[PDB]
């Protein structure tokens, strides 16, 4: 593996603020720049997935095409890139002809599009490749889920229209059948397969039981009444989020409810007030998670047994992005496990339904285990990826008993 040169490190430092690449970020970045190779990367939350697709076009001063149906989330990335002096924009049918002209003139490093826009605009992408050059196409499977196979099927012609352009496909699951469905839908040619599973040593892990009274359960975390710091309380349902918000509001707590059933403006308001610390706690479903852009989330409380080990690992990685000590508590009851099995029936892919079932069995072992919670989670990664935090009072509840 060739090491990054000084021109590469200077670019990384001035446009991204990082003094070095992480091993898999460089494996992906270098593979795109030098080999023009397709990539499938299993991304652990908090690792650094955005650098993998944003850095290569910024370095060579060309275009990176980013494909996702989540337009408002993509427009937040545009504003963040703007603050780093990286010209970026979202391109669609509502988006002006002056922006399209500037895209064709090579004025933007990163262009965000939806899979549907991409489907009827292969001629434009061939012109952009011919006139400026497309360093890479990026698509995250975790963004196309509401079934990524129908969004990714609209992207099957990308490889025939642009055979020289590498596709970097990201995934939030280590499922081998999902990786092979991504390789088929996108028609990837010998992609580099990477996994970024890592320990988050600044997150303390705990599993605890629900007493049968919301205020009784959430009282220990309260120190007027207030939480220790910015908190997210995850609930299995929209109704559960309103019930918890109601109980917390009896103690005049700075609260905001968040679920996918809420309107765009209402959700955007709760999200922004959380970032500005106008609310201290978000009682949410897992709809609140992607691009929170809040570094100081101190506490994640899963109010209900997590659906499975993989998704729980991904959800807690949203806490403590600043590197300071954070806590992740599970408050569960046996009845939740019966209700969690009902969500496996709504998984259409049979090969993934069997993978999620294994992940659910691992979550059940975790909830009933007396062994180090961190050791159970790390038992899915390379023996390199921790004896430091492990065994100490900051590791997990089981290490303290
Ligand atoms: N090379 C790096 N060195 C240090 N920190 C890094 C590096 N790459 C990324 N990070 C940090 O890793 C964290 C996660 O980055 P990303 O995965 O790009 O975040 P994201 O795309 O906003 O993901 P979500 O939506 O919040 S899971 C951010 O705080 C980055 O600044
Ligand atoms: C290739 C090694 C690797 O990083 N593997 C990997 N497995 N998983 C699934 C997982 C991890 C931890 C856990 F507690 C349950 C399930 C990964 C995820 C979820 C992301 C990135 C890499 C992962
Ligand atoms: Zn431990």
Domains, the chain: 6-195 (3.40.50.300), 203-400 (3.40.50.300)
- Residue 260's nearest CA partner among 291, 278, 237 is 237
Cα distances (angstroms) measured from residue 58 to each of 210, 317, 347: 49, 27, 38
Centre of ligand 3 to C-alpha 390, Å, is 5
DSSP state of 2: P
Binding site membership of 54 for ligand 1 (Cβ less than 6 Å): no
CA distance 78 to 86: 9
Cα distances (angstroms) measured from residue 259 to each of 49, 126, 238, 328: 25, 39, 6, 20
CA distance 202 to 298: 10
Report long-range pairs for 119-123 (Cβ below 8 Å, ≥24 apart).
119/154, 119/155, 119/157, 122/157, 122/158, 122/161
Annotated binding site: 18, 20, 22, 25, 46, 372, 395-396, 399
Centre of ligand 2 to C-alpha 43, Å, is 8
Helices (H) and strands (E) in the chain, counts: 17, 13
Judge contact between 212 and 315, C-beta under 8 A.
Answer: no
Centre of ligand 2 to C-alpha 211, Å, is 32
Rg of the chain over all Cα atoms, to the nearest angstrom: 22
- Structure-block tokens of residue 301: 């409380």
Cα distances (angstroms) measured from residue 77 to each of 157, 181, 276, 292: 26, 27, 18, 11
CA distance 194 to 67: 20
Binding site membership of 381 for ligand 2 (Cβ less than 6 Å): yes
Binding site membership of 227 for ligand 1 (Cβ less than 6 Å): no
Atom of ligand 1 nearest to the CA of 77: 22
Cα distances (angstroms) measured from residue 188 to each of 145, 168, 282, 323, 401: 20, 9, 40, 36, 49
Binding site membership of 24 for ligand 2 (Cβ less than 6 Å): no
- Residue 49's nearest CA partner among 36, 69, 71, 68 is 68
Token pair 């939806």 is found at 114
Centre of ligand 1 to C-alpha 46, Å, is 5
Binding site membership of 302 for ligand 1 (Cβ less than 6 Å): no
Binding site membership of 195 for ligand 2 (Cβ less than 6 Å): yes
Binding site membership of 321 for ligand 1 (Cβ less than 6 Å): yes
Q: What is the resolution of this structure in A?
A: 2.2
Strands in 285-342 per DSSP E: 299-303, 326-332
Which of 177, 205, 309, 313 best tests ligand 2's pocket when mutated (most atoms within 8 Å of CB)? 313
Binding site membership of 313 for ligand 2 (Cβ less than 6 Å): yes
- Structure-block tokens of residue 197: 């599973």
The count of C-alpha atoms lying within 13 angstroms of the C-alpha of 11, restricted to the half-sphere facing its C-beta, is: 15
- The 10 Å CB-count burial string (b at 16+, else e) for 233-247 is bbbbebebbeebbeb
Report long-range pairs for 248-253 (Cβ below 8 Å, ≥24 apart).
248/218, 248/281, 248/283, 250/215, 251/215, 251/222, 251/225, 252/224, 252/225, 253/222, 253/225, 253/226, 253/227, 253/280, 253/281
CA distance 135 to 58: 9
CA distance 339 to 248: 24
Centre of ligand 2 to C-alpha 352, Å, is 15
197 dihedral zone (left: phi>0; alpha: psi -120 to 50; beta): beta
Tell me the three state secondary structure of residue 257.
strand
The pocket of ion ligand 3, defined by CB under 5 A, consists of 372, 374, 395-396, 399
CA distance 335 to 359: 18
Cα distances (angstroms) measured from residue 12 to each of 29, 84, 133, 344: 11, 11, 21, 42
Strand partners, 231: 281, 299
Strands in 83-211 per DSSP E: 88-90, 110-113, 134-140, 167-171, 192-195, 203-209
Judge contact between 56 and 28, C-beta under 8 A.
Answer: no
Centre of ligand 1 to C-alpha 48, Å, is 4
Binding site membership of 309 for ligand 2 (Cβ less than 6 Å): yes
Element (H, E) at 256: strand 255-258
Question: Angle, nearest 10°, between helix axes 50-60 and 6-15?
Answer: 110
Work out the end-to-end distance of the chain between its first and last CA atoms, rounded to an integer number of angstroms. 44
Judge contact between 352 and 310, C-beta under 8 A.
Answer: no
**Backbone φ, ψ for residue 91 (5° rounding):** -115, 125
Of the bound ligands, which one is closest to the alpha carbon of residue 206? 3
């Amino acid at each position: 593996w060739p090491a990054p040169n000084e021109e590469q490190v200077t670019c990384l430092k001035m446009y991204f603020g990082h003094s070095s690449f992480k091993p898999v970020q460089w494996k992906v970045i270098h593979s795109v720049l030098e080999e023009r190779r397709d990539n499938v990367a299993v991304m652990a939350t908090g690792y650094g997935k955005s650098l993998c697709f944003q850095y290569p076009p910024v370095y060579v001063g060309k275009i990176g095409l980013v494909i996702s149906p989540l337009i408002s989330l993509m427009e937040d990335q545009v504003l963040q890139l703007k603050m780093s002096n990286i010209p970026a924009c979202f391109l669609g049918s509502a988006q002006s002809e002056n922006v399209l002209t500037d895209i064709k003139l090579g004025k933007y490093r990163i262009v965000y599009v939806t899979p549907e826009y991409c489907s009827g605009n292969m001629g434009l992408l061939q012109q952009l490749e011919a006139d400026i050059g497309i360093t890479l196409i990026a698509v995250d499977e975790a963004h196309c889920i509401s079934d990524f196979r129908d969004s990714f099927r609209k992207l099957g012609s990308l490889k025939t229209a642009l055979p020289m352009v590498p596709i970097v496909a990201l995934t939030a699951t280590a499922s081998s059948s999902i990786r092979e469905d991504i390789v088929r839908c996108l028609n990837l040619r010998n992609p580099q397969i990477t996994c970024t599973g890592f320990d988050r040593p600044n997150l303390y892990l705990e599993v605890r039981r629900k007493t049968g009274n919301i205020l009784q359960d959430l009282q220990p975390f309260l120190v007027h009444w207030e939480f220790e710091g910015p908190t997210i309380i995850y609930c299995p349902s929209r109704k559960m989020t309103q019930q918890v918000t109601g109980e917390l509001r009896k103690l005049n707590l700075s609260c905001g409810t968040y679920h996918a059933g809420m309107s765009f403006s209402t959700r955007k308001d709760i999200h922004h007030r959380f970032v500005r610390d106008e609310i201290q706690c978000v009682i949410a479903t897992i709809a609140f998670g992607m691009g929170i852009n809040k570094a100081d989330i101190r506490q994640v409380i899963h109010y209900g047994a997590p659906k499975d080990m993989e998704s729980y690992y991904q959800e807690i990685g949203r806490a403590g992005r600043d590197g300071l000590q954070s806590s992740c508590h599970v408050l569960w009851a046996p009845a939740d496990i019966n209700l969690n099995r009902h969500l496996l029936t709504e998984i259409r892919n049979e090969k993934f339904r069997l993978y999620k079932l294994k992940m659910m069995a691992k979550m059940e072992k975790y909830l009933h285990s007396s062994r180090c919670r961190r050791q159970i989670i790390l038992s899915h990664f390379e023996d390199k990826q921790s004896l430091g935090i492990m065994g100490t009072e900051k590791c997990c509840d089981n290490c303290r008993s």
